[PDB]
């Protein structure tokens, strides 16, 4: 069924890459390749707040 | 209360005595006025201060986020998470409610105890040199100047000194 005028779909995927590891992409089509990645370092566990309260 | 002094045999309190929680009111030939007993007041202050701190500061928590996010095919563990959050809410509400209920009773008794004990320290000094006229007052059987007053409060009232004069006034 059309969702935003799209009879098709597109799944999104994600994974982490350890310091000093390799990741390999390989496809004959239908691949939405990455353009930007993010070098991150996650600290202690936190949450997400959903509120109209201003900052 | 339990000790039966505050709202008991001492009907009301004194809005004039502003030095502390417990004290005396005297009148003699050379004046009158209020004066708080700091020895018992400080003990209550030091004791109550330690009590409020013990409830506040025995509560120590670590950093935590309660917000967990579950999609539409995880309603089971979303209701589990709700059972945990609602479970802690029920416990901490019942504990805090009952604690303040119970310790407010204990604190009001603690002030009743201090007034009772402060009264007995005076009674056991003026054994029969003064008259227990009720309402937590003593009427002396002798002339007690401001020097004599400061000795009853100090706890150094000289019974054998005034026993001579109080014997004949009892008639
Ligand atoms: C009060 O009691 C103390 C107890 O040691 C005593 O030394 C003192 O002489 C008494 N009188 C006054 C006025 O402090």
Automatic annotation (TrEMBL), chain A:
Coiled-coil regions listed in the entry: none
Top-level taxon: Viruses
Subcellular location: Host apical cell membrane; Virion membrane
Signal sequence residues: none
Mod. after translation: Palmitoylated. In natural infection, inactive HA is matured into HA1 and HA2 outside the cell by one or more trypsin-like, arginine-specific endoprotease secreted by the bronchial epithelial cells. One identified protease that may be involved in this process is secreted in lungs by club cells.
Family membership noted in the UniProt record: Belongs to the influenza viruses hemagglutinin family.
Subunit structure: Homotrimer of disulfide-linked HA1-HA2. Interacts with human CACNA1C.
Function summary: Binds to sialic acid-containing receptors on the cell surface, bringing about the attachment of the virus particle to the cell. This attachment induces virion internalization either through clathrin-dependent endocytosis or through clathrin- and caveolin-independent pathway. Plays a major role in the determination of host range restriction and virulence. Class I viral fusion protein. Responsible for penetration of the virus into the cell cytoplasm by mediating the fusion of the membrane of the endocytosed virus particle with the endosomal membrane. Binds to sialic acid-containing receptors on the cell surface, bringing about the attachment of the virus particle to the cell. This attachment induces virion internalization of about two third of the virus particles through clathrin-dependent endocytosis and about one third through a clathrin- and caveolin-independent pathway. Plays a major role in the determination of host range restriction and virulence. Class I viral fusion protein.
Protein's name according to its UniProt entry: Hemagglutinin
Lineage: Viruses, Riboviria, Orthornavirae, Negarnaviricota, Polyploviricotina
Full-sequence portion shown in this chain: 235 to 289 of 566
TrEMBL record, chain B:
Cystine residue pairs: 144-148
PTM per Swiss-Prot/TrEMBL: In natural infection, inactive HA is matured into HA1 and HA2 outside the cell by one or more trypsin-like, arginine-specific endoprotease secreted by the bronchial epithelial cells. One identified protease that may be involved in this process is secreted in lungs by club cells.
GO terms assigned for molecular function: host cell surface receptor binding
Main location: host cell
Places the protein is found: Host apical cell membrane; Virion membrane
GO BP term, pick one: clathrin-dependent endocytosis of virus by host cell
Biological role stated in the UniProt entry: Binds to sialic acid-containing receptors on the cell surface, bringing about the attachment of the virus particle to the cell. This attachment induces virion internalization of about two third of the virus particles through clathrin-dependent endocytosis and about one third through a clathrin- and caveolin-independent pathway. Plays a major role in the determination of host range restriction and virulence. Class I viral fusion protein.
Assembly and oligomerization: Homotrimer of disulfide-linked HA1-HA2. Interacts with human CACNA1C.
Protein name in the entry: Hemagglutinin
Positions spanned in the full protein: 345 to 515 of 566
């Amino acid at each position: 069924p059309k969702v935003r005028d799209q009879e098709g779909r597109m799944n999104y995927y994600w994974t982490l890459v350890e310091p000093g590891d390799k990741i390999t992409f390989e496809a004959t089509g239908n691949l939405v390749v990455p353009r930007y990645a993010f070098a991150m370092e996650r600290n202690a566990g936190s949450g997400i707040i959903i509120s109209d309260t201003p900052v | 209360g339990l000790f039966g002094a505050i709202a008991g045999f001492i009907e009301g309190g004194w809005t004039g005595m502003v030095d502390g929680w417990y004290g005396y009111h005297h009148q003699n030939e050379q004046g009158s006025g209020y004066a708080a007993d700091l020895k018992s007041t400080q003990n209550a202050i030091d004791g109550i201060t330690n009590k409020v701190n013990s409830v506040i500061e025995k509560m120590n928590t670590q950093f935590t986020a309660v917000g967990k996010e579950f999609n539409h095919l995880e309603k089971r563990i979303e209701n589990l998470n709700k059972k945990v959050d609602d479970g802690f809410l029920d416990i901490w509400t019942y504990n805090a409610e009952l604690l303040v209920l119970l310790e407010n009773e204990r604190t009001l008794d603690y002030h009743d105890s201090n007034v009772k004990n402060l009264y007995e320290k005076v009674r056991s000094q003026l054994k029969n040199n003064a008259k227990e006229i009720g309402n937590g007052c003593f009427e002396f059987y002798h002339k007690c100047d401001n020097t004599c007053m400061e000795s009853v409060k100090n706890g150094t009232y000289d019974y054998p000194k005034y026993s001579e004069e109080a014997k004949l006034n009892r008639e």
